[PDB]
Paper text:
The monomer RdFucI consists of 19 α-helices and 23 β-strands comprising N1, N2, and C domains.
However, there is no Fo-Fc electron density map (counted at > 5σ) that is suspected to be bound to Mn2+ as an essential metal for substrate binding. The B-factor analysis revealed that the temperature factor of Mn2+ (70.53 Å2) is higher than the average temperature factor of the protein (36.22 Å2), indicating that Mn2+ is present on RdFucI with a low occupancy. The biochemical and structural results indicated that the active site of apo RdFucI is not fully occupied by Mn2+ and, thus, isomerase activity was low. The distance between the metal binding site and the surface of the substrate binding pocket is approximately 16.7 Å, which implies that the active center is located deep in a pocket.
Residue numbers in the entry:
A (entry chain C), B (entry chain F), C (entry chain B): 5 to 591
Write the structure that this text describes.
Amino acid sequence: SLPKIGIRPVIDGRRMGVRESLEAQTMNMAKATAALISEKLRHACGAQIECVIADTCIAGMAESAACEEKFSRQNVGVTITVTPCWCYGSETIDMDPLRPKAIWGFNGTERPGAVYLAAALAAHSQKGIPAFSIYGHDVQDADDTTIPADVEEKLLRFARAGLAVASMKGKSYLSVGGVSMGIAGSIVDHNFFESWLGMKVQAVDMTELRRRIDQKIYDEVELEMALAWADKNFRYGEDQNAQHYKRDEEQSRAVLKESLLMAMCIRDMMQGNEKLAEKGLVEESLGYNAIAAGFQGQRHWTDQYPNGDTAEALLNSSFDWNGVREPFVVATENDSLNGVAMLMGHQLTGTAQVFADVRTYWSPDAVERVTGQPLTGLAEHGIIHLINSGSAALDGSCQQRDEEGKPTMKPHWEISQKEADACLAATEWCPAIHEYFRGGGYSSRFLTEGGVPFTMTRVNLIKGLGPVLQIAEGWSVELPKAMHDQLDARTNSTWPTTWFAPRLTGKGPFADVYSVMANWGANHGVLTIGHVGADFITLAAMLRIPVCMHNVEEGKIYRPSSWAAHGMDTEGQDYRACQNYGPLYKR
Amino acid sequence: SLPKIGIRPVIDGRRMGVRESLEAQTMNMAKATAALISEKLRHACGAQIECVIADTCIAGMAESAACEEKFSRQNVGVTITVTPCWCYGSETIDMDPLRPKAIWGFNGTERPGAVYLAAALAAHSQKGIPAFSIYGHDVQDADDTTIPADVEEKLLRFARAGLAVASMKGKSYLSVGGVSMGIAGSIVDHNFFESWLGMKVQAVDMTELRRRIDQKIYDEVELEMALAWADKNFRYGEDQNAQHYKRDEEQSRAVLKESLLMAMCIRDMMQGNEKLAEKGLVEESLGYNAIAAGFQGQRHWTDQYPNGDTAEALLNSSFDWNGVREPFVVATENDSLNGVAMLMGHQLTGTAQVFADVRTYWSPDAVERVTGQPLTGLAEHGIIHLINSGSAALDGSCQQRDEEGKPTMKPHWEISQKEADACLAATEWCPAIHEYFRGGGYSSRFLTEGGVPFTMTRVNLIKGLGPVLQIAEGWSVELPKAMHDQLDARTNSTWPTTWFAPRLTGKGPFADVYSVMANWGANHGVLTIGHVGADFITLAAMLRIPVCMHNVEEGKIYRPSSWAAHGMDTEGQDYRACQNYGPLYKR
Amino acid sequence: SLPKIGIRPVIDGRRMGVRESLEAQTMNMAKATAALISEKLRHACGAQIECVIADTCIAGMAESAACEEKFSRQNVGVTITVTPCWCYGSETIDMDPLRPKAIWGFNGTERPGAVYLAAALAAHSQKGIPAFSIYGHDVQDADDTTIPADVEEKLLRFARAGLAVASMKGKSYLSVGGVSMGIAGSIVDHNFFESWLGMKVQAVDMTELRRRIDQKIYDEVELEMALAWADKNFRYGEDQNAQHYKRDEEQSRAVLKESLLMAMCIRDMMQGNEKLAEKGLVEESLGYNAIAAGFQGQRHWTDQYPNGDTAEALLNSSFDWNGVREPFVVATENDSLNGVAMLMGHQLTGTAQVFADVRTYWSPDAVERVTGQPLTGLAEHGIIHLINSGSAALDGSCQQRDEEGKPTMKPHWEISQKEADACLAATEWCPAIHEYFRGGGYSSRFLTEGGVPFTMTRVNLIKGLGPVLQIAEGWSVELPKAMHDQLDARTNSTWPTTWFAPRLTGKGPFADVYSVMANWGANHGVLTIGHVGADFITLAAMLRIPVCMHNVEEGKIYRPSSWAAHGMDTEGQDYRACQNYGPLYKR
Ligand SMILES: [Mn+2]
Ligand SMILES: [Mn+2]
Ligand SMILES: [Mn+2]
């Protein structure tokens, strides 16, 4: 069952007609908040966000304890306190240190809820339980019940990030394999998951995956559907292996058969499968309660079996042979930390997530030297070649369309079957180069459309400091055919490409495009649809994860108010604040 | 190359016949220090210990810098400073923070080396680079060159532990697989290894072990030679599987072939193998430079392939089909912490290391009730049943015998081929139980001889504290045959057994045998020949690992001098000193 | 023996075509790197920098360990890892926490070394052993082996700073005396030298210097030579003492005898002298293995003996009566911390360093008032008067000429006996003011040619924070003869002067010349030739000394990549990182 949002209507507790004349506007403010959250947001899996409201208004500790009573039978993992009047600070606040929480005070004069706001926040900072401030810019009249725009932005940005926190809590990351080729993020730090994210790590040796294929621990008929669906939809590309390693058609099919089985089995390991209990496999039917996972792959699987290019691509996509569905989060090379960003991205936007190698920086001087023509448009300052080593959510094609017909990526509940199939139509499945992937495989090649707003992210673990978050907002660019073809043939022309131009600021890591590339803390990165840096910044704050690098605009930074107290500078306050509060779940 | 010991003859710098009169004595003291070590100790692998001696006696920084220059070319991992006279304190001490160091000062009057000792230990403690103190009880005459027994004991103990520290440095732990059945020690902590031991960790998925077998990455002739040896030498035990799950003589054969192959490939992966380079297989031939390893096994491997019972038991022995050799160190269930303790065990003694489940405490009352007779002798206060899940070095039979003819375990260089054969002859190979090990395997059942002194060790990781070492000295015991048979049938009769009685002290966890069992901080322990507690304590202080439990006498506790300054109490001083100096290699 | 630079060619392990295709290009990359360093850089003492290359390319732990055995024995104090391909991250990195480390990734598409780069740094940052990123701006063709300019700059800045770190390790600072007149820097912090610089501190009482002179512990024949050379070249200036304190010739000669004997004797105390051993003085022959020194002088030496003016100036110079040579580092007033800035400067340039009082800030207003003229050219924003109290390296005249006409200070291997003679000739040796230096002495007066680019530095020790480094890049300026003669005579006309204009930046302590003066954290500073701010910064980052004050171009800040993780702000990231990683050799 899913996490719910709690709403606390707090009130001035004194009578003689004072409390009485506020009970109507106060409850109504609560119900307006819950309606707005339910109207305008869903959980990432698509279900409706349920809100829970206190039975009475809250004036002091007796009502607060009864509200908490109620909240705690109902699995609420985020709370919003609201009021249009003075109330008695520390008598009425939410003392629970785990849940993200915010307070919204009506900017009024007959109704001075934002004066409670200031005192309630002071209580919060003083008691070490930071809270988020919702305070509208414009005085509203005592009877105006319309929620303004600046308020809505904050109520929705907060609610979104908080549900992301609540939804991770209790869940698993499934490490299918160990380290891949000495990549840092594939050394899965269990304490990081437990302490900062409230998550668990289940480790399972890639042999288990081989056992499930070999011992028929999957729905045999689902495979037939998968193969049938691949025949209908899969357009193949040129095998670029040397002739003596090229595979024939019977070998080619068995490779495709195994690849799709890989996907099915991994998925089954993540979320369970009822059909296995029906076959006498009750233990294997449960799965491991994982909301994200890693597949090591290289080297020990790929030196003998088909690679996970195809399974990674499909499981991270918004659809497969069973129809459109919520994308999973499955990380190439068991890179758990790229896995966590993907997970953050998915919990924030409801959409599919593109794993990427941060492959090349193409400077203007360099692009001219080799193609004889200049980088232009959004691309003029330099450009970054993002291109995973085989696999990417097919959504990354960006053949899905928004209401003005522009190319984009959507949440699964608004993806039609025509758009799913157009994503496939943009994709050519290419044989894995044998020497690297000795057991074979099919890479999901597509070319991401131009001018699409994107946000690149990466979590890194730093000894002595801990987790940090990197963020770079930009756009995909569209290169002239001759130019694209040339830089692509030179690189890895069997692999999915996105050409990325980061927005610059003139300052620090965003002085020029080279600086963006050079300060990136790993070889992998995550691409999330939209400009969603502010959403990441907020969530990084609820998790007490410093943001070490970002290009989001000053005025959009939204953190608990006690951050302001660790400094005016928006980087210094964050390291100090994050140092102070530490990880949420244990230290 | 092996670590060398550096020996520093340090002297009074002033002349007018003073220094001149002390040169012979000072340098001959240094050479006798070297001769004693090389007579009495060997590296764990069996090689001679090499001791480098400075070119000149050292009376200041110039000569000290020359000595360090000389030592930095000869791979010296531990130093001993010796002197018969007064010398200039901080001008002469070894300043290297990383290496075990000690100071032996001659306890004379005309030759007051122990006065320098006191002053140098003070500089060491004030400059934060602790050193061990060697100071004989009895005043010695100025021309006495013989080394008293109390000084020998300390020099030898300091060197044992010192070289263990230096031999782990730079080397790998090989994790073949990941976590086994959620056991803490098999969630492998790369940082503990890097920071406390100066080791790296190579992780490898168990599918590489499969790949090596399937794709014939091994010496094909050695297998045949190994199978031959196995046929000739292996006694077999009653097959206790239910009839429908039993294997036939053909499938039995295969389980054996594969069990020995795993032995071979795990070994090959640990240390490399040049036959693979002859064979065309140049990448696999190097190995991973591991002095310890673990094999995950359950669940994911053993649910389809033969178990590591035979591999682990043979590898952990001082002998296989290629004859007597140094025993390897391979933890069952990838229990890396038991690994470390076996590592420490093997480096301190050169002997084979018994991995055990700390399985049952049998109180006096419990034994009377189930058998109708009481425990008596060394067992009268209670008994701890030590018994791994199928594997244990065959040395552990203790069929090997000393000069007195008593049962014992020995360094591999004192083991005759007659004794190797005798340990095999005391061993019966028993089929794995199918329900638990679905791909089969052969366990290694022997009963450990009684009256042999052992030391039970375990390392654990405590969040917020770091590594700790537990130690229990005691003796194996022999039960009368009806008692043994009865308790054995009740427990896991196909597995190797050792009945252990820990020496009690009346205090703490050693107040009674129950408390020893209760305080043990994991399901697994390691059993090391003799009473080697003091060696382990010394080694731990060198690694700054607090010892949270031991039963060693106060007067044998031997640690760096600056531990006295942390308190009179032998536990308080230990936690505070380790907290102060912290891990050796980093942070 | 001198530190060497170790080069680690790193490569994809997989065979079957791939590794074999890369062995040549990888190993040449490495050969070309070593070659660049040996052709373009020298040790400060002038010797050729030897490099050591792994015997094979490194693709995993076995070769990594092999490369380390070869480095361990060859005195490698710094490593540069190079690759043109993808490699297995944390299996191939250099794990030694003490050594400065660089990684160079080739920016190719077919050769994606920079992708290894990003993944190895992530591994470095994750494991707490920061490493410098060397990454070219422009993509090179697979077949291009030219090393671009931006890569060259960083290879050399890194190497230059790396050798400085390793050249200090194990060497002594010789404190000749103790505190001089309550100056902080002269209360020598032994723990600072040992923990941050890996050095030792040998203290000696000035009476020992008195002893060498009076009992003739020096080369008597050399003394006749040193006098004859002084006679020929020493141009004596005016005696500004009140008449009753001037000295006859016979008394003035005795002062010069001794001033020169102080140079010989301090030098011999620093580094030994084999002639003392010919003369039967075996103990005093060894020296104290010092690379830096300080001489207290005031108050207790100078109230009865000739001061250190002449000695300090000649020892700090690149020449004396035995010809050109490496300049020593000898701090006046035993200001050990100015000694540290000097040693740093000498290690990073091979040049003579200029010890200075930061004496007077002359504002624009104030020069108008006093001289009638205004400050023009580089002096227009303010000037700072740099005048040590009696001595300075004669190199600081800037009578040396570079390959052009221009005035400069040079590495001694590029200094002619002509340019030595010339440096002496632009210097007047003026008697010491008796009331301050009652033992007499000769001050070394010269005036520094203007327009010369200079970097000013100081190390300060801040209780509760540790060491911090101060940098100010600027120029010497020339002033009208009438303007300078007013300011000189108002101040201290017998001491060497340099007029200094610091380059401003609008913000912080570089907002105006006043603020540079006001924020300088000591009364003393060091002058180093050229704009070597960025060298100081990089060397400071290697030693984990935060920079509290600098006017260096943002874009030239070159620090280990894990600094970037501690923030975008280039100052906050430095305090956080330094606080994290702490001193190199012990905490
Ligand atoms: Mn990748
Ligand atoms: Mn077990
Ligand atoms: Mn002064």
